[PDB]
Amino acid sequence: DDCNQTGQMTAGFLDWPQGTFASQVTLEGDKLKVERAIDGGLETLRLKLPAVVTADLRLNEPRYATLPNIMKAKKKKIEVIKPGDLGVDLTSKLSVISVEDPPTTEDLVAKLK
Amino acid sequence: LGFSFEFTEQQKEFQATARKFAREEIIPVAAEYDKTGEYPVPLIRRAWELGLMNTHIPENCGGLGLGTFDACLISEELAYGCTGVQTAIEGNSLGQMPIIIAGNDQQKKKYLGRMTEEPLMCAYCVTEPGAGSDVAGIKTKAEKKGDEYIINGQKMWITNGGKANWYFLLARSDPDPKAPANKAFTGFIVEADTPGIQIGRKELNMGQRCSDTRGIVFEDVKVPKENVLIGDGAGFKVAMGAFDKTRPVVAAGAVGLAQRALDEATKYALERKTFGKLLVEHQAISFMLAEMAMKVELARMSYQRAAWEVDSGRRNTYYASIAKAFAGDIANQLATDAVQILGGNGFNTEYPVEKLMRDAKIYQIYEGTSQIQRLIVAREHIDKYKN
Amino acid sequence: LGFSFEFTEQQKEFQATARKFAREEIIPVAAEYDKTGEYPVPLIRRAWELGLMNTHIPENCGGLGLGTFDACLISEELAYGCTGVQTAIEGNSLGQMPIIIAGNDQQKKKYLGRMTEEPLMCAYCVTEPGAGSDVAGIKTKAEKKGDEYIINGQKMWITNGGKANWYFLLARSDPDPKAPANKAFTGFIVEADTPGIQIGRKELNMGQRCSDTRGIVFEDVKVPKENVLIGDGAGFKVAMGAFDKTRPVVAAGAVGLAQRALDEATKYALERKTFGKLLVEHQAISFMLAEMAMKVELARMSYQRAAWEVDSGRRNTYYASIAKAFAGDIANQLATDAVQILGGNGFNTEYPVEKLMRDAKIYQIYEGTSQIQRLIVAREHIDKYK
Amino acid sequence: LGFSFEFTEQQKEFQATARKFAREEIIPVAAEYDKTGEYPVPLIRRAWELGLMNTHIPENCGGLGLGTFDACLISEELAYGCTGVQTAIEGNSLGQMPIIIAGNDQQKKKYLGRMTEEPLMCAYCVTEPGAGSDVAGIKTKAEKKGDEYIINGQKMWITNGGKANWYFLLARSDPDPKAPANKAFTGFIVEADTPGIQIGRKELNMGQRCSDTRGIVFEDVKVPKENVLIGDGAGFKVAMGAFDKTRPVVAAGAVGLAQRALDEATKYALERKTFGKLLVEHQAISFMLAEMAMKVELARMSYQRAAWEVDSGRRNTYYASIAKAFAGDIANQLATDAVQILGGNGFNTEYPVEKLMRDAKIYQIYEGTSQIQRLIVAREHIDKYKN
Amino acid sequence: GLGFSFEFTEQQKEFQATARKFAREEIIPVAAEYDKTGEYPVPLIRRAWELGLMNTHIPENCGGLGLGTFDACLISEELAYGCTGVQTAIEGNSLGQMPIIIAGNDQQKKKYLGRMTEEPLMCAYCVTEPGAGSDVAGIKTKAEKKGDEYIINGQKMWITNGGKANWYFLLARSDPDPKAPANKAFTGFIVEADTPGIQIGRKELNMGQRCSDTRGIVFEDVKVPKENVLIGDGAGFKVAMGAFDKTRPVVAAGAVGLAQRALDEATKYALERKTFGKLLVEHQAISFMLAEMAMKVELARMSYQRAAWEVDSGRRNTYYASIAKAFAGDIANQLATDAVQILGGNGFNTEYPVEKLMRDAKIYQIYEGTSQIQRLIVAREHIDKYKN
Ligand SMILES: Cc1cc2nc3c(=O)[nH]c(=O)nc-3n(C[C@H](O)[C@H](O)[C@H](O)COP(=O)(O)OP(=O)(O)OC[C@H]3O[C@@H](n4cnc5c(N)ncnc54)[C@H](O)[C@@H]3O)c2cc1C
Ligand SMILES: Cc1cc2nc3c(=O)[nH]c(=O)nc-3n(C[C@H](O)[C@H](O)[C@H](O)COP(=O)(O)OP(=O)(O)OC[C@H]3O[C@@H](n4cnc5c(N)ncnc54)[C@H](O)[C@@H]3O)c2cc1C
Ligand SMILES: Cc1cc2nc3c(=O)[nH]c(=O)nc-3n(C[C@H](O)[C@H](O)[C@H](O)COP(=O)(O)OP(=O)(O)OC[C@H]3O[C@@H](n4cnc5c(N)ncnc54)[C@H](O)[C@@H]3O)c2cc1C
Ligand SMILES: Cc1cc2nc3c(=O)[nH]c(=O)nc-3n(C[C@H](O)[C@H](O)[C@H](O)COP(=O)(O)OP(=O)(O)OC[C@H]3O[C@@H](n4cnc5c(N)ncnc54)[C@H](O)[C@@H]3O)c2cc1C
């Protein structure tokens, strides 16, 4: 869906601070130092620590599901539940109308802009 | 009970890892290693770190104790990146298999254990300069002398031949030529740093060039008696039992390559225009791609069938030799056509298909040639009908 | 889960019945029926009794309600005995399929129901003197004309054409030649003794001679609006939809005959001697035998796969066209090969293989020729790369 | 010298006669004779009249004294009409050849002359139920009893077997099983109405249905020693030597069948439309016709090669067996493909291709099987290299 | 005339022995070094020129021998048996020369054919482009007439002898209107390699025929004198087309030379290597393979002979040359892989002759018109006999 909303939105409902698009993370006790990727470069933040952080590309290189551990993970547990339980609705005043397909230098810097 | 062509979720996650490593780490350097013919160490160590090697080794030796089916789905993925590197790490199951199927409890925790601890290679040495297909014309002699044996002779075309910690070794036990093959040969576990052993220079072949292959000369090589596999004369059964569990994996290798050939030819056919149209709009090219797709899909199932039969406890000689003969064959057919569709570019050394043609030819020769596969299938077939 | 290549215990039961029927009852008379070419009415009825026919009809309508994978099982066993016989039987599933997948409960209870209660036949009418492979080329006209349509035109090569109770018919219901396949064809069920329906002479083909294949014309044939399949102009979608669940089975037919070819050839090589040796002991003949084995095993898996795909919920189009394409070709290779092994005898009518060769050519033609199959596969394949 | 692929002017007109005949007189009745199995006596007599039969018979017996190349080009034009009717005409030259090459002047003027005088048939007799391919395994007894031999046994599959004035018969004289083929069998000429000769019924084959093909039984049959060909135990050479001059014309038969199937598929593909285009505008149909026309053209040169070789004093064996193998294989390939191009019409009896496919199959079998043709080629070939 | 003959002229038996002696005494001994290194085999090319086995189509009045297409095929088969890389480098000359032979004037022929007579210069056929090979009519290299010259702008791809050539035959787009047909859109030039504007690219690295140089060439403002245009403006596509009648058979002879080498190798070896107690040739399957391989070669040989005989007779031979190049190329690949196969593991190994033959052969189904293209031509020729 290319959204970029859930992290932010979760952080709002808990009223916790959000550290969006993180390139780096540290605990400084009951505070998180969060580097984040903004348009010009990297801004740094500090957050009181119930917190919400959304991983950006830069943050890390994810690891491989190691064959041994794929097996070991078949043991570990997974509680399976409903949204109805947690006390959440679901009904949605959004609706998709459609999903189509994509289709001098004075003109050109104009047609990039 | 019931036919199923769907993987376990465990196998899916295996395939996904195998495939992440194949596309991400093998492919981007596979031409580089084919060009230099250098043994691909960093990748073998990575694959070992990921748990993708020595997959048959049982749990009580610190192994994963996984099926023939799992090896096959894994190794199709590695092959798709490169059959040179897939063959390298396949050499281990080959050398290991006899010990897994024929070794005692100390033999097993000794030679299998170490594979669990570091990434060491092993190889299977049977072929000699005078015999490959006719395994029963092996003439490397092995004499009992007290508490041990004296191995004398020369082995050819051995994968990991210069890279192995240890060898499965098959050698002629009995001088009597009236001796039945089935009881004429002994099979050993033979550490590679034994005195007498002379590994040769790297063999330069047309294909799978980064894989290590070489001749070995054994002179007066002392093998401790408690590394004999089952007994004297026992080797021939042992060596032959191995294939059940390894032939499917070689076939699965071939489809890997065929699949690669198919994707490379299908991408190009969607870019290149001739006479104002994409190549896919040329019925002859579609016909070609269809047939490649047919051959791959059946090749795939065939190795899937052989892997399932042995995993079910049954023996699979018929099905496995079907899979190798067909896979071998269609890997080659698919390599050339991929070259052909790419055209002039396909014949060039910076496009990725030319390597596949060169890599592919091996699959009609090692691990049993296209001819001796058909004798095996014919023999199993005929036997179903006689009293 | 995991992969499995084992039949279910109940499937083995089906297979067992089908094998025993084919070898005990079909084989003994298959050659007479090939010589004479008369429609094998006993064995049909008999197949009907043993439950090896109309396997697709849901229990809803007193059918046995089995999948495509079961229909393939049985069809291979029947075909091993005879593809003429086995074709006439599959003729009925061809006819049923469009109603099975696209009828309402009335249409199903009515036209599938009756098949349950007695061994009635039925046929699939699409091919025409001018179009076969190109289904959007059919010209047979249906004009809406009240609470009913009027059918005009000529179909051709209809299995069971002259032995059927009713027909799936497909006709050009939009006269504007610019209209698409999707909107231009309506598909009907059509009772055979409807006035206008003129059934032709029996056609005389190379093979599957006991099969009833014939032409049939329609002159102002009236068909009630109650018998339209999904609605006006859904004929194409419908006719097309049948193929997923029929082609796998046509391929099992091909595999059956392949198996038979190979069995005959192998028996003969084990007992015939030349240059002092059983034919088996010549490396050439061995290699032949082995290559044929290969082909069969592979052809069988291909169909088993397509069937499972469709029984599992999903479209099997790519898979079913691969199985058809390959089973059909290797059937023709096996049969001429099997003739080759028997030598002079092989070319002779008093031996069983010569028949196989004449039977097997059809499997590269009907239900979509080898070439059309390949277009489909290319299409399915290629679309996966954009 | 210099290569040439142009006919003599005579050869060109011989071709026209045979083509006039086949297209006017054979073609419009061929399917009728196929449907019925009636031995086509009007056409044989007609072919005899036009000098298109017994063409190998020397001049000094009143035959045309033509060469193998001539007989080949005639034989193609005939086969194109029908291989049922031309196999019956060729039968004659098969019966006549072992007398042409190995008979004495008496033998020739008597048994060849009558062929020259009226439309008689003769036949060739070697095959038995027990053997066809393995000629050195024939068991028909030929014992020296007087100024004669007594002939006991059974021949099977004999073209014109029920229609011949006389037979070339091959039977095993030396009863010591330890004797070579070289010395073991005798060739004979045998008047058909000799007593002791019981001719069985017309066998029914898939194809060449108008050709007459049957078994002959030989109960105590008395043959004059005069009807021996050169002497005792020389029968194998004579029957082997016949093939140089016959194997080429069989190949030319195959090609005629091939050329017919090509034309029919071409004529049709230029009239049938599908998906808006003519068949011929679908690249795959184009490629089939193109692979077909390649195949006919190469088989023709091959039989032409082998005719020329022998017509010029040379031994044929390699070039004749190549052309026999190849013409045979491709006729079968051409017939299915022609049935294929015509679709459902192809499969049906009202069209000319269904016949072609059933006719085409004996070409892999008789006058030497496909398999043994390769044993011959193999052999001739390996022999240029044995130093 | 007289009937058929498959007998060489005495004179042609003499050409045959010379090419063979060369191929066998001089090429064979060194082809695997030149294949291993990609080194352009200058001695052998000079030695083949010396011996008059090169530029043989050149007519006598330009200093050549004016040999036919049959003669040229004999000789190539012989060279190709030794090495296809070498023979391709020799052969390129004929391809470059051919449009000048068939379409050049007296000043053009004398000047540019004639110089080939007195030194072993090379020339090249400059057609294929990054974007078009099979579809000749898709080439876009520009030629605009500006003065009594033309100015060539374009890039060329896969040019055999491309960086070794005294001059080039070059095909270029003369007509800017893209709607302009192939019969009007193109003009063929003779271009001297040392013209300013011409930049020879790097040696391109292929699977096979590695000693042959094949190269990209870029033309940047290249000045071409009006007198080096072939028949005139817009004749380019016919002139390039016409070169093929005389050349297809010879590349077919090349494929046959390599085919025959493969056979001879695999036969020699199957008469010394034994398995299971017997020699390879006593195993039936191997024997059958050698047999089918021998068929394949004999038939290919006749096929190209027939093509060559047709054009020497003053007939256009499109149909027959296309069967040759289709059949010869398909079977050269077939024979190569079998030869490997029969040598088992050794065959896959680089110290044995055959793997190379397998790497060498694939190009025969690509260049001088793909396998598929040849079938389109054969189809078109075949079907026209039936349109009335
Ligand atoms: C890259 C590579 C890696 C290898 N790795 C190993 C390895 O790690 N371990 C190992 O033990 N070996 C290995 N080998 C050797 C390989 O297994 C053998 O080459 C193969 O078994 C074929 O044997 P051969 O080369 O001796 O050929 P041969 O046995 O001489 O066979 C020659 C040819 O004749 C055919 N032939 C032989 N006998 C018959 C017959 N009975 N009937 C019909 N045809 C016959 C063969 O199919 C082949 O085409 C490797 C080989 C290669 C090329
Ligand atoms: C014994 C028999 C029984 C039959 N029974 C039935 C039945 O009961 N019900 C029914 O509806 N039909 C039936 N048919 C019809 C059968 O399915 C058709 O013959 C088949 O679909 C092919 O169509 P066609 O004969 O019109 O050939 P065509 O469509 O004319 O095909 C001619 C040739 O051209 C090729 N071709 C056609 N279009 C293309 C193109 N797109 N691109 C490349 N190649 C192309 C074909 O592959 C073929 O080789 C039967 C046919 C037979 C022979
Ligand atoms: C229409 C017809 C007309 C005939 N007319 C005549 C005639 O007029 N005169 C006459 O003498 N005969 C005639 N024959 C007989 C015919 O020539 C034989 O059928 C033929 O020689 C093949 O021999 P077979 O039938 O005994 O096959 P078999 O010898 O039993 O062989 C059967 C199969 O095994 C194969 N095979 C046998 N040996 C080997 C081997 N060592 N290695 C590999 N493969 C092997 C064969 O190729 C064949 O595929 C005719 C046959 C037919 C069908
Ligand atoms: C080693 C080498 C040397 C060469 N030397 C020369 C030389 O010196 N001079 C020169 O001019 N060129 C030379 N070439 C170029 C060569 O001739 C071309 O590569 C060839 O003619 C066609 O190549 P392509 O790469 O453009 O094929 P593409 O046009 O990219 O075709 C790719 C594939 O599509 C298929 N295809 C394309 N169009 C159709 C269609 N309409 N219908 C069916 N199939 C189709 C082709 O068969 C082929 O398999 C050389 C090439 C090589 C590899």
Side-chain angles (χ1 to χ4, degrees), chain C residues 205-221 223-224 226-236 238-243:
Chain C
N205 311 333
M206 183 155 85
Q208 300 182 153
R209 253 122 47 109
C210 81
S211 187
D212 181 71
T213 300
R214 59 178 75 192
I216 144 175
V217 343
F218 294 81
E219 211 168 351
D220 297 322
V221 174
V223 184
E226 348 318 305
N227 275 356
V228 165
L229 260 159
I230 272 161
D232 216 60
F236 204 80
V238 173
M240 238 72 285
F243 297 128

Side-chain angles (χ1 to χ4, degrees), chain D residues 70-108 110-116 118-138 140-143 146-177 179-182 184-221 223-224 226-236 238-272 274-276 278-348:
Chain D
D70 296 313
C72 281
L73 83 94
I74 284 159
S75 172
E76 195 187 315
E77 298 296 339
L78 297 182
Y80 183 90
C82 175
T83 50
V85 343
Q86 95 80 198
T87 293
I89 297 165
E90 180 47 31
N92 263 29
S93 281
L94 266 93
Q96 291 162 25
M97 205 69 254
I99 270 168
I100 289 190
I101 70 182
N104 63 43
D105 187 63
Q106 198 273 46
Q107 287 167 335
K108 326 219 261 99
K110 173 171 189 178
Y111 291 116
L112 273 16
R114 51 178 92 179
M115 315 311 311
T116 260
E118 355 177 3
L120 303 176
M121 308 318 289
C122 57
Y124 175 96
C125 284
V126 168
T127 306
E128 309 175 16
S133 291
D134 178 19
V135 179
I138 53 101
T140 293
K141 292 168 137 281
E143 40 255 303
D147 266 46
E148 60 201 36
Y149 294 75
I150 317 289
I151 294 294
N152 278 104
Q154 175 165 203
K155 305 316 217 185
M156 187 40 161
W157 304 125
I158 309 311
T159 319
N160 302 341
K163 305 304 211 209
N165 200 249
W166 52 273
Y167 296 103
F168 163 72
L169 192 140
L170 190 77
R172 188 196 165 90
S173 16
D174 194 343
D176 174 36
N182 195 39
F185 311 93
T186 291
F188 300 86
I189 302 167
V190 191
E191 308 234 356
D193 56 18
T194 302
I197 299 173
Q198 275 94 240
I199 283 162
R201 82 288 176 70
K202 171 183 179 42
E203 313 295 313
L204 311 185
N205 304 333
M206 191 165 53
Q208 303 184 150
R209 294 229 220 82
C210 83
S211 183
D212 180 76
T213 297
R214 40 231 297 181
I216 322 293
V217 173
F218 283 90
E219 261 225 307
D220 283 320
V221 161
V223 201
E226 11 296 317
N227 289 12
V228 169
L229 273 319
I230 49 203
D232 260 343
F236 200 92
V238 317
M240 288 321 277
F243 299 142
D244 281 25
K245 295 169 153 283
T246 67
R247 276 179 189 356
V249 300
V250 199
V255 165
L257 189 169
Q259 183 56 65
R260 181 58 187 282
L262 180 49
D263 291 3
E264 294 288 359
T266 305
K267 290 160 198 165
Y268 189 87
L270 284 174
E271 36 217 32
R272 176 69 162 191
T274 57
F275 302 90
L278 290 172
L279 264 37
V280 104
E281 304 172 52
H282 290 119
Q283 224 178 42
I285 294 288
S286 260
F287 273 60
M288 277 182 73
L289 287 166
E291 286 177 349
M292 276 147 80
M294 281 171 65
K295 293 180 210 192
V296 178
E297 295 274 8
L298 297 198
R300 175 170 308 125
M301 282 183 278
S302 75
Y303 86 69
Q304 286 171 336
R305 183 58 142 78
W308 185 81
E309 290 289 311
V310 74
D311 269 352
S312 59
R314 259 172 255 201
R315 228 192 71 159
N316 248 357
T317 301
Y318 163 89
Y319 292 111
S321 293
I322 283 169
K324 157 72 167 84
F326 195 74
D329 292 330
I330 71 99
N332 288 254
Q333 284 162 43
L334 261 79
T336 29
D337 277 352
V339 170
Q340 194 72 204
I341 279 168
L342 277 66
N345 289 341
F347 193 58
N348 162 261

